[PDB]
Design a protein around this ligand. Structure first.
Ligand SMILES: O=C([C](F)N1[C]=N(F)[C]=N1)C1=[C][C]=[C][C]=[C]1
Ligand SMILES: [Mg+2]
Lengths: 150, 151
């Protein structure tokens, strides 16, 4: 169906962008709003309300650019805003080698049902935060499975 | 001022801030503003964005060696319609011979539309505008803003 084709296209755009950033070890933080509304956090960023594309996602997160600091928040199959604030988790059970991007992802996952993808700038490793837990060192296939499950 | 006029002022401010940032850093850029002649055929050659304008997004689009930096950004009113778009190349003899494809593309679209195109040179950081087949080079910040306000 049209809705199904659009969801699969968005998943492919995300995974292609994550692949490019993982390979180059470009830090990234991408939160996908689900049932819990995230308007208060969207409002902290730069409004985009843009069509999703792998190219736009990559261009957003290039280091030392205006938009790369903070989270991209996606809502209703669009990029709602970039450079958004997310709350930092105080969970003592996050790997100590991880920094602010990962704590921000876990933090938003503690108070919403959202799914957040993180690319580490140190290693290029890909992780997902959901329900207050961080799922680390994902393969491409694991990330796709999580996006399809969500 | 009406909401429409205030929105236009915000868009001009966003454009001028982005152009000034890129000029200072010799970031090449090609930004066409659609006017009354529709540019859909050219918009459809690019990557669709349909995004709200911001200086931050304009700058991010043109960062060298990124997916979106080659080709034209096309704006429709207060939106970035698409990036990495094709524009036709002008054969005009009044394009300075040292200028590259971005300037030739800007003059080219200006020959078949009433659009206004801004170009930042990656060689010199100079700012130019193409309109109605004519290229106006080495614009000051003040001149660019005046051109946009008049448009
Ligand atoms: O990229 C990547 C992976 F890991 N992935 C994950 N996800 F999730 C997506 N992708 C790579 C490849 C190769 C080399 C390095 C790196
Ligand atoms: Mg002069």
């Amino acid at each position: 169906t049209p809705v199904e084709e659009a969801q699969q296209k968005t998943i492919e755009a995300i995974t292609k962008a994550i692949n490019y950033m993982a390979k180059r070890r470009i830090g990234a933080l991408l939160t996908i709003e689900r049932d819990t509304g995230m308007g208060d956090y969207i409002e902290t960023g730069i409004p985009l309300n843009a069509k999703v594309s792998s190219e736009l996602l990559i261009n957003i997160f290039i280091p030392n650019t205006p938009l790369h600091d903070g989270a991209v928040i996606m809502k209703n199959n669009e990029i709602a805003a970039a450079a958004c604030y997310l709350p930092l988790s105080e969970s003592p059970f996050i790997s100590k080698e991880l920094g602010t991007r990962h704590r921000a992802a876990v933090g938003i996952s503690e108070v919403t049902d959202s799914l957040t993808i993180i690319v580490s700038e140190e290693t290029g490793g890909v992780s997902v935060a959901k329900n207050g837990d961080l799922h680390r060192e994902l393969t491409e296939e694991a990330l796709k499975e999580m996006l399809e499950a969500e």
